[PDB]
Short mmCIF file of C-alpha atoms in Angstrom, two decimals:
data_model
loop_
_atom_site.label_atom_id
_atom_site.label_comp_id
_atom_site.label_asym_id
_atom_site.label_seq_id
_atom_site.Cartn_x
_atom_site.Cartn_y
_atom_site.Cartn_z
CA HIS A 17 -13.46 1.77 25.50
CA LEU A 18 -13.41 3.04 21.81
CA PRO A 19 -14.35 1.08 18.68
CA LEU A 20 -11.15 -0.10 16.84
CA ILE A 21 -9.92 2.24 14.06
CA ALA A 22 -9.84 0.92 10.43
CA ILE A 23 -6.20 1.19 9.58
CA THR A 24 -7.07 0.06 5.96
CA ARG A 25 -3.57 -0.86 4.69
CA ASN A 26 -1.88 2.20 6.31
CA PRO A 27 1.32 1.16 8.15
CA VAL A 28 2.39 3.77 10.71
CA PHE A 29 5.98 3.14 11.56
CA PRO A 30 7.23 4.08 15.05
CA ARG A 31 8.54 7.53 15.58
CA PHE A 32 7.56 8.76 12.27
CA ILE A 33 4.82 11.38 11.91
CA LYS A 34 2.18 9.97 9.53
CA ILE A 35 -1.34 10.74 8.16
CA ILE A 36 -4.30 8.44 8.02
CA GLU A 37 -7.35 9.07 5.76
CA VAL A 38 -9.91 6.31 6.08
CA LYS A 39 -12.72 6.56 3.65
CA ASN A 40 -15.48 5.70 6.23
CA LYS A 41 -17.16 8.64 7.99
CA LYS A 42 -18.12 6.22 10.99
CA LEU A 43 -14.63 6.57 12.45
CA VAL A 44 -15.21 10.54 12.42
CA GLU A 45 -18.01 10.02 14.81
CA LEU A 46 -15.46 8.63 17.20
CA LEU A 47 -12.96 11.44 16.49
CA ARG A 48 -15.58 14.08 17.15
CA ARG A 49 -16.60 12.09 20.19
CA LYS A 50 -12.88 12.58 21.36
CA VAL A 51 -12.53 16.24 20.55
CA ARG A 52 -14.38 16.95 23.81
CA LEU A 53 -11.63 15.11 25.86
CA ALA A 54 -9.04 17.15 27.63
CA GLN A 55 -6.54 14.59 26.53
CA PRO A 56 -7.57 13.30 23.14
CA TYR A 57 -5.96 10.03 21.92
CA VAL A 58 -6.13 7.57 19.30
CA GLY A 59 -4.63 4.17 18.93
CA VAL A 60 -2.63 2.68 15.96
CA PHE A 61 -2.64 -1.12 15.22
CA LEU A 62 -1.52 -3.29 12.41
CA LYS A 63 -3.84 -5.39 10.26
CA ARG A 64 -3.31 -9.18 10.08
CA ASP A 65 -3.10 -11.36 6.82
CA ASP A 66 -6.12 -11.15 4.40
CA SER A 67 -7.32 -7.55 4.83
CA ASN A 68 -11.08 -7.00 4.80
CA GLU A 69 -12.60 -3.66 5.89
CA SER A 70 -15.87 -5.44 6.55
CA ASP A 71 -14.17 -7.80 8.90
CA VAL A 72 -12.46 -5.01 10.86
CA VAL A 73 -15.84 -3.83 11.95
CA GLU A 74 -17.34 -7.41 12.26
CA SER A 75 -14.57 -9.24 14.07
CA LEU A 76 -11.87 -7.94 16.32
CA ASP A 77 -9.25 -10.61 15.74
CA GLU A 78 -8.17 -9.26 12.23
CA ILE A 79 -6.39 -6.38 13.83
CA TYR A 80 -3.09 -7.48 15.33
CA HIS A 81 -2.91 -7.32 19.13
CA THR A 82 -0.04 -4.93 18.59
CA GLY A 83 -1.15 -1.38 19.02
CA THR A 84 0.65 1.86 18.99
CA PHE A 85 -1.36 4.36 21.23
CA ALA A 86 -0.27 7.94 20.60
CA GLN A 87 -1.67 11.36 21.34
CA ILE A 88 -3.57 13.07 18.58
CA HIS A 89 -1.58 15.93 16.80
CA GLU A 90 -3.84 18.27 14.59
CA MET A 91 -6.73 17.76 12.29
CA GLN A 92 -6.51 19.16 8.72
CA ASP A 93 -9.33 17.89 6.60
CA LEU A 94 -8.39 20.00 3.53
CA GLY A 95 -10.30 17.84 1.15
CA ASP A 96 -11.65 14.66 2.71
CA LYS A 97 -13.68 14.87 5.82
CA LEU A 98 -11.29 12.42 7.73
CA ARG A 99 -7.51 13.21 7.71
CA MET A 100 -6.21 12.41 11.15
CA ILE A 101 -2.53 12.49 11.80
CA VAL A 102 -1.02 9.73 13.85
CA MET A 103 2.58 8.96 15.10
CA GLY A 104 4.33 6.18 16.91
CA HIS A 105 4.78 6.99 20.71
CA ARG A 106 3.30 4.37 23.04
CA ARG A 107 3.80 0.86 21.66
CA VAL A 108 1.65 -1.79 23.31
CA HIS A 109 0.75 -5.55 22.91
CA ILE A 110 -2.74 -6.09 24.10
CA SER A 111 -3.49 -9.25 25.77
CA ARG A 112 -6.79 -9.48 23.97
CA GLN A 113 -7.95 -6.84 21.62
CA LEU A 114 -11.32 -8.45 21.49
CA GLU A 115 -11.57 -7.65 25.35
CA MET A 166 -9.37 -3.21 26.04
CA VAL A 167 -7.20 -4.26 28.93
CA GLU A 168 -3.68 -2.92 28.36
CA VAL A 169 -0.13 -2.53 29.87
CA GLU A 170 2.93 -1.08 28.43
CA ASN A 171 4.98 -4.06 28.10
CA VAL A 172 7.63 -2.25 26.21
CA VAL A 173 10.41 -4.69 26.71
CA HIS A 174 13.88 -3.36 26.53
CA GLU A 175 16.26 -5.99 27.93
CA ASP A 176 19.89 -5.03 27.54
CA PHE A 177 23.44 -6.50 28.08
CA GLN A 178 25.60 -5.53 30.91
CA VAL A 179 28.19 -4.17 28.46
CA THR A 180 26.48 -1.06 27.07
CA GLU A 181 29.05 0.20 24.83
CA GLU A 182 29.00 -2.18 21.95
CA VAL A 183 25.42 -3.33 21.80
CA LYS A 184 24.47 -0.20 19.90
CA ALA A 185 27.17 -1.02 17.30
CA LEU A 186 24.93 -3.37 15.21
CA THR A 187 22.70 -0.37 14.60
CA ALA A 188 25.76 1.38 13.07
CA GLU A 189 26.14 -1.55 10.65
CA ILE A 190 22.38 -1.18 9.92
CA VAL A 191 22.84 2.50 9.13
CA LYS A 192 25.86 1.65 6.92
CA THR A 193 23.69 -0.66 5.00
CA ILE A 194 20.99 1.93 5.02
CA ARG A 195 23.61 4.28 3.73
CA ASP A 196 24.01 2.21 0.65
CA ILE A 197 20.37 2.05 0.03
CA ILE A 198 19.66 5.80 0.23
CA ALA A 199 22.84 6.50 -1.74
CA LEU A 200 22.09 4.15 -4.52
CA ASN A 201 18.17 4.71 -4.31
CA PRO A 202 17.52 8.03 -2.66
CA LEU A 203 13.82 8.33 -1.84
CA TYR A 204 13.96 10.48 1.27
CA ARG A 205 16.56 13.03 2.35
CA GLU A 206 19.58 11.51 4.00
CA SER A 207 19.23 14.42 6.44
CA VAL A 208 16.70 12.41 8.65
CA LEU A 209 19.52 10.01 8.91
CA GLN A 210 21.68 13.10 9.79
CA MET A 211 19.12 14.10 12.40
CA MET A 212 19.57 10.82 14.32
CA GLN A 213 23.43 10.39 13.81
CA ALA A 214 25.55 8.24 15.95
CA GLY A 215 28.02 11.00 16.76
CA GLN A 216 25.44 13.75 17.89
CA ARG A 217 24.15 12.18 21.24
CA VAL A 218 20.48 13.13 20.50
CA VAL A 219 19.32 9.55 20.22
CA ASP A 220 17.70 9.17 23.70
CA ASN A 221 15.59 6.06 22.48
CA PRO A 222 17.91 3.83 20.24
CA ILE A 223 15.34 0.96 20.15
CA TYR A 224 12.88 3.20 18.36
CA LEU A 225 15.72 4.29 16.00
CA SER A 226 16.27 0.66 15.14
CA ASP A 227 12.47 0.47 14.49
CA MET A 228 12.81 3.46 12.23
CA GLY A 229 15.60 1.90 10.43
CA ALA A 230 13.70 -1.37 9.87
CA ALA A 231 10.89 0.85 8.64
CA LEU A 232 12.94 1.83 5.61
CA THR A 233 12.86 -1.94 4.63
CA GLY A 234 10.09 -2.32 2.04
CA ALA A 235 8.90 -5.64 3.45
CA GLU A 236 5.09 -6.20 3.82
CA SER A 237 3.61 -5.40 7.36
CA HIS A 238 3.06 -9.10 8.27
CA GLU A 239 6.82 -9.40 8.32
CA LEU A 240 6.94 -6.23 10.45
CA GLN A 241 4.68 -8.13 12.86
CA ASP A 242 7.23 -10.89 12.77
CA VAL A 243 9.82 -8.48 13.70
CA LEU A 244 7.65 -7.19 16.48
CA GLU A 245 7.14 -10.59 17.93
CA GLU A 246 10.90 -10.72 18.63
CA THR A 247 11.78 -9.55 22.12
CA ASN A 248 15.44 -10.06 22.35
CA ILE A 249 17.47 -7.12 20.89
CA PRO A 250 20.00 -9.10 18.81
CA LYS A 251 17.19 -11.25 17.30
CA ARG A 252 14.87 -8.30 16.26
CA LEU A 253 17.97 -6.58 14.87
CA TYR A 254 18.81 -9.78 13.07
CA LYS A 255 15.31 -9.99 11.54
CA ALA A 256 15.39 -6.26 10.58
CA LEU A 257 18.98 -6.80 9.15
CA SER A 258 17.59 -9.65 7.07
CA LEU A 259 14.88 -7.43 5.75
CA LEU A 260 17.41 -4.67 5.03
CA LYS A 261 19.65 -7.14 3.03
CA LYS A 262 16.60 -8.51 1.33
CA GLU A 263 16.00 -5.02 -0.05
CA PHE A 264 19.73 -4.44 -0.77
CA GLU A 265 20.40 -7.24 -3.14
CA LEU A 266 17.30 -6.71 -5.30
CA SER A 267 18.01 -3.00 -5.36
CA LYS A 268 21.58 -3.60 -6.47
CA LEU A 269 20.28 -5.97 -9.08
CA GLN A 270 17.97 -3.54 -10.47
CA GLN A 271 20.51 -0.77 -10.76
CA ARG A 272 22.87 -3.07 -12.46
CA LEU A 273 20.19 -4.28 -14.72
CA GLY A 274 19.19 -0.70 -15.71
CA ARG A 275 22.67 0.53 -16.42
CA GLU A 276 23.40 -2.71 -18.15
CA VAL A 277 20.48 -2.10 -20.55
CA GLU A 278 21.73 1.42 -20.99
CA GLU A 279 25.30 0.68 -22.01
CA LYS A 280 23.86 -1.84 -24.53
CA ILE A 281 21.88 0.98 -25.96
CA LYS A 282 24.82 3.27 -26.06
CA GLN A 283 26.78 0.55 -27.88
CA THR A 284 23.94 0.35 -30.31
CA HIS A 285 24.00 4.04 -30.79
CA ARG A 286 27.83 3.70 -31.34
CA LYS A 287 27.42 1.29 -34.00
CA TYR A 288 24.73 3.34 -35.77
CA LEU A 289 27.04 6.25 -35.62
CA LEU A 290 29.78 4.11 -37.03
CA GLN A 291 27.58 2.99 -39.90
CA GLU A 292 26.43 6.65 -40.39
CA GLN A 293 29.93 7.83 -40.54
CA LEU A 294 30.95 5.12 -43.06
CA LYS A 295 27.91 6.07 -45.27
CA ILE A 296 28.67 9.74 -45.40
CA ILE A 297 32.41 8.80 -46.13
CA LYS A 298 31.32 6.48 -48.97
CA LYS A 299 28.86 9.26 -50.27
CA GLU A 300 31.02 12.24 -49.97
CA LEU A 301 34.66 11.20 -50.71
CA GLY A 302 35.61 9.01 -53.73
CA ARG B 252 51.16 4.47 26.32
CA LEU B 253 51.89 3.00 22.87
CA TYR B 254 51.10 -0.54 24.05
CA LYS B 255 47.74 0.51 25.61
CA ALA B 256 46.99 2.24 22.33
CA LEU B 257 47.95 -0.93 20.41
CA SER B 258 45.91 -3.31 22.71
CA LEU B 259 42.94 -0.96 22.21
CA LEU B 260 43.51 -1.21 18.39
CA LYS B 261 43.48 -5.02 18.89
CA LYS B 262 40.18 -4.85 20.80
CA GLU B 263 38.67 -2.38 18.23
CA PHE B 264 39.71 -4.64 15.36
CA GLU B 265 38.47 -7.81 17.01
CA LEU B 266 35.17 -5.95 17.50
CA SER B 267 35.00 -4.77 13.89
CA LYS B 268 35.93 -8.28 12.79
CA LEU B 269 33.32 -9.91 14.88
CA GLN B 270 30.63 -7.40 13.69
CA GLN B 271 31.81 -7.61 10.12
CA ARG B 272 31.54 -11.37 10.38
CA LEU B 273 28.31 -11.20 12.15
CA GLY B 274 26.95 -9.32 9.17
CA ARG B 275 28.74 -11.62 6.70
CA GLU B 276 27.22 -14.75 8.33
CA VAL B 277 23.70 -13.29 8.51
CA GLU B 278 24.15 -12.04 4.97
CA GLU B 279 25.17 -15.58 3.87
CA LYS B 280 22.02 -16.87 5.67
CA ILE B 281 20.12 -14.35 3.57
CA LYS B 282 21.84 -15.42 0.36
CA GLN B 283 20.41 -18.91 0.98
CA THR B 284 17.13 -17.57 -0.64
CA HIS B 285 17.52 -18.73 -4.14
CA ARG B 286 18.35 -16.60 -7.05
CA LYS B 287 15.27 -17.76 -8.77
CA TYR B 288 13.41 -15.69 -6.21
CA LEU B 289 15.36 -12.69 -7.71
CA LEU B 290 14.17 -13.87 -10.99
CA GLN B 291 10.72 -13.93 -9.68
CA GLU B 292 11.18 -10.39 -8.58
CA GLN B 293 12.22 -9.55 -12.15
CA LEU B 294 8.96 -11.07 -13.17
CA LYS B 295 6.96 -9.03 -10.79
CA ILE B 296 8.97 -5.83 -12.02
CA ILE B 297 7.87 -6.68 -15.53
CA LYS B 298 4.26 -6.75 -14.64
CA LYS B 299 4.74 -3.61 -12.41
CA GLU B 300 5.78 -1.69 -15.46
CA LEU B 301 3.49 -3.46 -17.86
CA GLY B 302 -0.01 -2.24 -17.16
CA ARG C 252 0.98 56.25 -23.62
CA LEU C 253 2.17 54.55 -20.31
CA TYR C 254 -0.82 52.32 -20.05
CA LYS C 255 -0.60 51.41 -23.70
CA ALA C 256 3.08 50.61 -23.52
CA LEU C 257 2.40 48.38 -20.54
CA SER C 258 -0.28 46.82 -22.67
CA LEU C 259 1.96 46.18 -25.56
CA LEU C 260 4.45 44.77 -22.96
CA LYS C 261 1.89 42.42 -21.57
CA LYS C 262 0.95 41.42 -25.16
CA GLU C 263 4.38 40.35 -25.94
CA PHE C 264 4.33 38.55 -22.50
CA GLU C 265 1.24 36.69 -23.59
CA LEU C 266 2.61 35.60 -26.94
CA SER C 267 5.81 34.54 -25.39
CA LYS C 268 4.34 32.49 -22.53
CA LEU C 269 2.22 30.59 -24.92
CA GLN C 270 5.15 29.88 -27.10
CA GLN C 271 7.15 28.63 -24.01
CA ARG C 272 4.31 26.51 -22.65
CA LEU C 273 3.84 24.90 -26.05
CA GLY C 274 7.53 24.27 -26.33
CA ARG C 275 8.11 22.64 -23.08
CA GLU C 276 5.06 20.59 -23.70
CA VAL C 277 6.06 19.31 -27.05
CA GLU C 278 9.44 18.50 -25.66
CA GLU C 279 8.09 16.50 -22.79
CA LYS C 280 5.81 14.67 -25.01
CA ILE C 281 8.93 13.65 -26.93
CA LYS C 282 10.76 12.73 -23.69
CA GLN C 283 7.73 10.78 -22.53
CA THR C 284 7.74 9.02 -25.89
CA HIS C 285 11.41 8.13 -25.53
CA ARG C 286 11.28 7.39 -21.79
CA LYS C 287 8.55 4.80 -22.42
CA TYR C 288 10.68 3.47 -25.31
CA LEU C 289 13.44 3.04 -22.92
CA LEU C 290 11.23 1.29 -20.15
CA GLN C 291 9.92 -0.96 -22.84
CA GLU C 292 13.47 -1.75 -23.76
CA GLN C 293 14.36 -2.89 -20.29
CA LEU C 294 11.16 -5.04 -20.38
CA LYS C 295 12.59 -6.61 -23.29
CA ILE C 296 16.00 -7.19 -21.90
CA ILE C 297 14.52 -8.75 -18.70
CA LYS C 298 12.44 -10.95 -20.76
CA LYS C 299 15.66 -11.71 -22.82
CA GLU C 300 17.85 -12.69 -19.83
CA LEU C 301 15.29 -15.43 -18.98
CA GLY C 302 12.46 -15.76 -21.58
#
Protein backbone atom coordinates (compact mmCIF):
# COMPACT_ATOMS: atom_id res chain seq x y z
CA HIS A 1 0.00 0.00 0.00
CA LEU A 2 2.36 2.72 -1.22
CA PRO A 3 1.73 5.26 -4.02
CA LEU A 4 3.39 4.25 -7.27
CA ILE A 5 6.85 5.66 -7.91
CA ALA A 6 7.37 7.97 -10.90
CA ILE A 7 10.00 6.07 -12.90
CA THR A 8 10.21 9.00 -15.36
CA ARG A 9 12.03 7.36 -18.27
CA ASN A 10 14.51 5.46 -16.01
CA PRO A 11 14.91 1.82 -17.20
CA VAL A 12 16.21 -0.36 -14.33
CA PHE A 13 17.48 -3.53 -15.92
CA PRO A 14 17.41 -6.80 -13.90
CA ARG A 15 20.42 -7.57 -11.70
CA PHE A 16 22.23 -4.32 -12.42
CA ILE A 17 22.68 -1.76 -9.69
CA LYS A 18 21.10 1.53 -10.78
CA ILE A 19 20.20 4.98 -9.44
CA ILE A 20 16.90 6.89 -9.72
CA GLU A 21 16.72 10.67 -9.27
CA VAL A 22 13.12 11.80 -9.76
CA LYS A 23 12.67 15.56 -9.71
CA ASN A 24 9.47 15.51 -7.63
CA LYS A 25 9.90 15.78 -3.86
CA LYS A 26 6.54 14.11 -3.17
CA LEU A 27 8.15 10.71 -3.65
CA VAL A 28 10.61 11.58 -0.88
CA GLU A 29 7.68 11.85 1.50
CA LEU A 30 7.15 8.17 0.78
CA LEU A 31 10.85 7.39 1.05
CA ARG A 32 10.95 9.01 4.46
CA ARG A 33 7.76 7.24 5.42
CA LYS A 34 9.60 3.95 4.68
CA VAL A 35 12.88 4.82 6.49
CA ARG A 36 11.12 3.91 9.76
CA LEU A 37 10.40 0.37 8.49
CA ALA A 38 12.73 -2.37 9.69
CA GLN A 39 12.72 -3.84 6.15
CA PRO A 40 12.48 -0.81 3.85
CA TYR A 41 11.60 -1.61 0.28
CA VAL A 42 10.73 0.02 -3.03
CA GLY A 43 9.21 -1.27 -6.24
CA VAL A 44 10.41 -0.69 -9.77
CA PHE A 45 8.08 -0.78 -12.77
CA LEU A 46 8.35 0.20 -16.41
CA LYS A 47 6.31 2.97 -18.06
CA ARG A 48 3.99 2.29 -20.99
CA ASP A 49 3.83 4.13 -24.31
CA ASP A 50 3.26 7.92 -24.25
CA SER A 51 5.04 8.90 -21.06
CA ASN A 52 3.34 11.59 -19.00
CA GLU A 53 4.40 12.36 -15.44
CA SER A 54 1.02 13.94 -14.65
CA ASP A 55 -0.70 10.76 -15.73
CA VAL A 56 1.53 8.62 -13.50
CA VAL A 57 0.02 10.38 -10.46
CA GLU A 58 -3.47 10.69 -12.05
CA SER A 59 -4.03 7.23 -13.57
CA LEU A 60 -2.38 3.96 -12.60
CA ASP A 61 -2.63 2.18 -15.98
CA GLU A 62 0.30 4.11 -17.49
CA ILE A 63 2.82 2.14 -15.50
CA TYR A 64 3.20 -1.37 -16.83
CA HIS A 65 1.85 -4.15 -14.65
CA THR A 66 5.41 -5.51 -14.58
CA GLY A 67 7.21 -4.49 -11.43
CA THR A 68 10.62 -5.27 -10.06
CA PHE A 69 10.38 -5.17 -6.29
CA ALA A 70 13.69 -4.90 -4.54
CA GLN A 71 15.11 -3.96 -1.20
CA ILE A 72 16.55 -0.49 -0.81
CA HIS A 73 20.34 -0.17 -0.77
CA GLU A 74 21.59 3.18 0.48
CA MET A 75 20.61 6.83 0.23
CA GLN A 76 23.21 9.31 -1.00
CA ASP A 77 21.57 12.67 -1.92
CA LEU A 78 24.82 14.48 -2.68
CA GLY A 79 23.15 17.28 -4.68
CA ASP A 80 19.49 16.60 -5.27
CA LYS A 81 17.25 15.74 -2.35
CA LEU A 82 16.09 12.49 -4.07
CA ARG A 83 18.78 10.03 -5.21
CA MET A 84 17.41 6.56 -4.46
CA ILE A 85 19.32 3.44 -5.47
CA VAL A 86 17.38 0.59 -7.06
CA MET A 87 18.34 -2.82 -8.36
CA GLY A 88 16.54 -5.76 -9.94
CA HIS A 89 15.80 -8.60 -7.55
CA ARG A 90 12.17 -9.80 -7.23
CA ARG A 91 10.45 -9.47 -10.58
CA VAL A 92 6.67 -9.54 -10.43
CA HIS A 93 3.73 -9.21 -12.83
CA ILE A 94 0.89 -7.61 -10.89
CA SER A 95 -2.63 -8.73 -11.79
CA ARG A 96 -3.95 -5.16 -11.47
CA GLN A 97 -1.59 -2.37 -10.51
CA LEU A 98 -4.66 -0.18 -10.11
CA GLU A 99 -5.80 -2.58 -7.37
CA MET A 100 -1.57 -3.97 -4.86
CA VAL A 101 -2.23 -7.71 -4.89
CA GLU A 102 0.88 -9.54 -5.98
CA VAL A 103 2.48 -12.92 -6.37
CA GLU A 104 5.95 -13.92 -7.50
CA ASN A 105 4.92 -15.54 -10.82
CA VAL A 106 8.57 -15.66 -11.84
CA VAL A 107 8.07 -18.44 -14.38
CA HIS A 108 11.14 -20.57 -15.17
CA GLU A 109 9.90 -23.50 -17.23
CA ASP A 110 12.78 -25.66 -18.46
CA PHE A 111 13.55 -28.58 -20.79
CA GLN A 112 14.37 -32.00 -19.37
CA VAL A 113 17.79 -31.98 -21.06
CA THR A 114 19.51 -29.22 -19.02
CA GLU A 115 22.91 -29.36 -20.67
CA GLU A 116 22.35 -27.63 -24.04
CA VAL A 117 19.51 -25.20 -23.04
CA LYS A 118 22.05 -22.69 -21.70
CA ALA A 119 23.97 -22.94 -25.01
CA LEU A 120 21.88 -20.28 -26.74
CA THR A 121 23.11 -17.84 -24.07
CA ALA A 122 26.65 -18.63 -25.26
CA GLU A 123 25.73 -17.54 -28.76
CA ILE A 124 24.13 -14.46 -27.21
CA VAL A 125 27.35 -13.62 -25.43
CA LYS A 126 29.37 -14.28 -28.58
CA THR A 127 27.22 -11.74 -30.39
CA ILE A 128 27.63 -9.51 -27.36
CA ARG A 129 31.38 -10.05 -27.66
CA ASP A 130 31.27 -8.49 -31.07
CA ILE A 131 29.35 -5.50 -29.76
CA ILE A 132 31.59 -4.74 -26.84
CA ALA A 133 34.62 -5.48 -28.99
CA LEU A 134 33.75 -3.22 -31.85
CA ASN A 135 31.96 -0.65 -29.65
CA PRO A 136 33.29 -0.82 -26.10
CA LEU A 137 31.08 1.20 -23.73
CA TYR A 138 31.48 -0.70 -20.47
CA ARG A 139 34.24 -2.99 -19.42
CA GLU A 140 34.14 -6.48 -20.75
CA SER A 141 35.09 -7.48 -17.18
CA VAL A 142 31.42 -7.57 -16.22
CA LEU A 143 31.11 -10.18 -18.94
CA GLN A 144 34.16 -11.76 -17.32
CA MET A 145 32.37 -11.65 -13.97
CA MET A 146 29.56 -13.78 -15.35
CA GLN A 147 31.56 -16.16 -17.58
CA ALA A 148 30.25 -19.54 -18.69
CA GLY A 149 33.38 -21.40 -17.52
CA GLN A 150 33.46 -20.05 -13.91
CA ARG A 151 30.23 -21.66 -12.41
CA VAL A 152 29.13 -18.51 -10.47
CA VAL A 153 25.97 -17.96 -12.59
CA ASP A 154 23.45 -19.39 -10.14
CA ASN A 155 20.62 -17.51 -12.00
CA PRO A 156 21.04 -17.83 -15.79
CA ILE A 157 17.59 -16.41 -16.63
CA TYR A 158 18.68 -13.15 -15.02
CA LEU A 159 21.94 -13.30 -16.97
CA SER A 160 19.91 -13.56 -20.18
CA ASP A 161 17.94 -10.53 -18.98
CA MET A 162 21.20 -8.71 -18.27
CA GLY A 163 22.40 -9.55 -21.77
CA ALA A 164 19.21 -8.38 -23.41
CA ALA A 165 19.69 -5.17 -21.41
CA LEU A 166 22.76 -4.32 -23.47
CA THR A 167 20.49 -4.04 -26.49
CA GLY A 168 19.69 -0.39 -27.13
CA ALA A 169 16.03 -1.03 -27.95
CA GLU A 170 13.35 1.11 -26.27
CA SER A 171 11.66 -0.04 -23.07
CA HIS A 172 8.36 -0.86 -24.82
CA GLU A 173 10.28 -3.57 -26.69
CA LEU A 174 11.64 -4.73 -23.32
CA GLN A 175 8.05 -5.14 -22.20
CA ASP A 176 7.46 -7.19 -25.34
CA VAL A 177 10.36 -9.41 -24.31
CA LEU A 178 8.91 -9.59 -20.76
CA GLU A 179 5.57 -10.83 -22.07
CA GLU A 180 7.37 -13.92 -23.39
CA THR A 181 7.19 -16.84 -20.95
CA ASN A 182 8.90 -19.60 -22.88
CA ILE A 183 12.66 -19.52 -22.62
CA PRO A 184 13.51 -20.05 -26.34
CA LYS A 185 10.95 -17.41 -27.32
CA ARG A 186 12.21 -14.66 -24.99
CA LEU A 187 15.76 -15.63 -25.96
CA TYR A 188 14.64 -15.36 -29.59
CA LYS A 189 13.25 -11.86 -29.13
CA ALA A 190 16.33 -10.80 -27.14
CA LEU A 191 18.50 -12.20 -29.92
CA SER A 192 16.54 -10.20 -32.46
CA LEU A 193 17.17 -7.05 -30.46
CA LEU A 194 20.83 -7.97 -30.24
CA LYS A 195 21.24 -8.45 -33.99
CA LYS A 196 19.22 -5.30 -34.52
CA GLU A 197 21.91 -3.40 -32.73
CA PHE A 198 24.68 -5.43 -34.43
CA GLU A 199 23.96 -4.58 -38.05
CA LEU A 200 23.44 -0.90 -37.45
CA SER A 201 26.59 -0.82 -35.38
CA LYS A 202 28.60 -2.62 -38.04
CA LEU A 203 27.22 -0.24 -40.61
CA GLN A 204 28.25 2.78 -38.55
CA GLN A 205 31.80 1.62 -38.08
CA ARG A 206 32.18 0.74 -41.72
CA LEU A 207 30.81 4.13 -42.66
CA GLY A 208 33.07 6.01 -40.28
CA ARG A 209 36.21 4.22 -41.45
CA GLU A 210 35.01 4.52 -45.07
CA VAL A 211 34.84 8.28 -44.76
CA GLU A 212 38.24 8.21 -43.14
CA GLU A 213 40.11 6.35 -45.88
CA LYS A 214 38.51 8.73 -48.36
CA ILE A 215 40.01 11.55 -46.33
CA LYS A 216 43.39 9.86 -46.25
CA GLN A 217 43.22 9.45 -50.00
CA THR A 218 42.39 13.12 -50.19
CA HIS A 219 45.44 13.89 -48.13
CA ARG A 220 47.54 11.59 -50.30
CA LYS A 221 46.51 13.54 -53.36
CA TYR A 222 47.23 16.86 -51.70
CA LEU A 223 50.66 15.59 -50.75
CA LEU A 224 51.24 14.34 -54.26
CA GLN A 225 50.35 17.73 -55.64
CA GLU A 226 52.54 19.45 -53.07
CA GLN A 227 55.52 17.26 -53.88
CA LEU A 228 55.08 17.97 -57.61
CA LYS A 229 54.85 21.71 -56.91
CA ILE A 230 58.02 21.75 -54.85
CA ILE A 231 59.65 19.61 -57.55
CA LYS A 232 58.66 22.11 -60.25
CA LYS A 233 59.73 25.05 -58.13
CA GLU A 234 63.05 23.74 -56.84
CA LEU A 235 64.62 21.73 -59.63
CA GLY A 236 64.72 22.78 -63.22
CA ARG B 1 37.74 -45.09 -26.91
CA LEU B 2 38.43 -43.42 -30.22
CA TYR B 3 34.97 -44.22 -31.56
CA LYS B 4 33.24 -42.86 -28.52
CA ALA B 5 35.37 -39.71 -28.93
CA LEU B 6 34.35 -39.46 -32.59
CA SER B 7 30.64 -40.02 -31.87
CA LEU B 8 30.92 -37.32 -29.23
CA LEU B 9 32.55 -35.09 -31.87
CA LYS B 10 29.62 -35.88 -34.14
CA LYS B 11 27.11 -34.94 -31.45
CA GLU B 12 28.96 -31.75 -30.66
CA PHE B 13 29.17 -30.71 -34.30
CA GLU B 14 25.50 -31.47 -34.81
CA LEU B 15 24.73 -29.26 -31.84
CA SER B 16 27.01 -26.46 -33.03
CA LYS B 17 25.49 -26.83 -36.46
CA LEU B 18 21.96 -26.62 -35.11
CA GLN B 19 22.83 -23.62 -32.92
CA GLN B 20 24.71 -21.88 -35.75
CA ARG B 21 21.75 -22.57 -38.03
CA LEU B 22 19.26 -21.46 -35.41
CA GLY B 23 21.18 -18.24 -35.25
CA ARG B 24 21.46 -18.04 -39.05
CA GLU B 25 17.72 -18.56 -39.49
CA VAL B 26 16.80 -16.06 -36.80
CA GLU B 27 19.35 -13.69 -38.31
CA GLU B 28 17.78 -14.10 -41.74
CA LYS B 29 14.38 -13.40 -40.21
CA ILE B 30 15.85 -10.20 -38.78
CA LYS B 31 17.41 -9.29 -42.18
CA GLN B 32 13.87 -9.17 -43.54
CA THR B 33 13.75 -5.68 -42.01
CA HIS B 34 14.47 -3.52 -45.01
CA ARG B 35 17.76 -1.84 -45.70
CA LYS B 36 15.72 1.36 -46.08
CA TYR B 37 15.24 1.16 -42.32
CA LEU B 38 19.02 1.25 -42.03
CA LEU B 39 19.01 4.31 -44.24
CA GLN B 40 16.36 5.76 -41.94
CA GLU B 41 18.78 5.07 -39.11
CA GLN B 42 21.38 7.01 -41.04
CA LEU B 43 18.92 9.86 -41.30
CA LYS B 44 18.39 9.80 -37.56
CA ILE B 45 22.15 9.75 -37.04
CA ILE B 46 22.50 12.83 -39.23
CA LYS B 47 20.05 14.74 -37.07
CA LYS B 48 21.59 13.36 -33.87
CA GLU B 49 24.87 14.97 -34.81
CA LEU B 50 23.25 18.03 -36.33
CA GLY B 51 21.88 20.14 -33.54
CA ARG C 1 67.21 32.25 1.80
CA LEU C 2 65.49 28.86 2.13
CA TYR C 3 62.04 30.49 2.06
CA LYS C 4 63.04 32.78 -0.79
CA ALA C 5 64.45 29.90 -2.82
CA LEU C 6 61.20 28.05 -2.30
CA SER C 7 59.39 31.16 -3.41
CA LEU C 8 61.36 31.45 -6.62
CA LEU C 9 60.73 27.78 -7.21
CA LYS C 10 57.02 28.25 -6.78
CA LYS C 11 57.27 31.32 -9.02
CA GLU C 12 58.64 29.19 -11.81
CA PHE C 13 55.93 26.66 -10.99
CA GLU C 14 53.36 29.37 -11.45
CA LEU C 15 54.61 30.59 -14.79
CA SER C 16 55.09 27.08 -16.00
CA LYS C 17 51.63 25.78 -15.13
CA LEU C 18 50.03 28.79 -16.74
CA GLN C 19 51.94 28.10 -19.94
CA GLN C 20 50.96 24.44 -19.91
CA ARG C 21 47.28 25.05 -19.25
CA LEU C 22 47.23 27.52 -22.06
CA GLY C 23 49.03 25.14 -24.36
CA ARG C 24 46.82 22.16 -23.80
CA GLU C 25 43.82 24.40 -24.11
CA VAL C 26 44.76 25.94 -27.44
CA GLU C 27 45.63 22.53 -28.77
CA GLU C 28 42.27 21.09 -27.75
CA LYS C 29 40.61 24.10 -29.29
CA ILE C 30 42.31 23.02 -32.49
CA LYS C 31 41.42 19.37 -31.97
CA GLN C 32 37.82 20.37 -31.40
CA THR C 33 37.89 22.48 -34.52
CA HIS C 34 39.14 19.56 -36.49
CA ARG C 35 36.97 16.94 -34.80
CA LYS C 36 33.87 18.93 -35.69
CA TYR C 37 35.25 19.33 -39.21
CA LEU C 38 35.52 15.55 -39.41
CA LEU C 39 32.01 14.92 -37.99
CA GLN C 40 30.65 17.37 -40.49
CA GLU C 41 32.48 15.47 -43.20
CA GLN C 42 30.67 12.28 -42.26
CA LEU C 43 27.39 14.23 -42.22
CA LYS C 44 28.24 15.15 -45.80
CA ILE C 45 29.17 11.61 -46.85
CA ILE C 46 25.98 10.17 -45.40
CA LYS C 47 24.05 12.82 -47.21
CA LYS C 48 26.09 11.93 -50.34
CA GLU C 49 25.36 8.20 -50.29
CA LEU C 50 21.64 8.92 -50.37
CA GLY C 51 20.90 12.61 -50.86
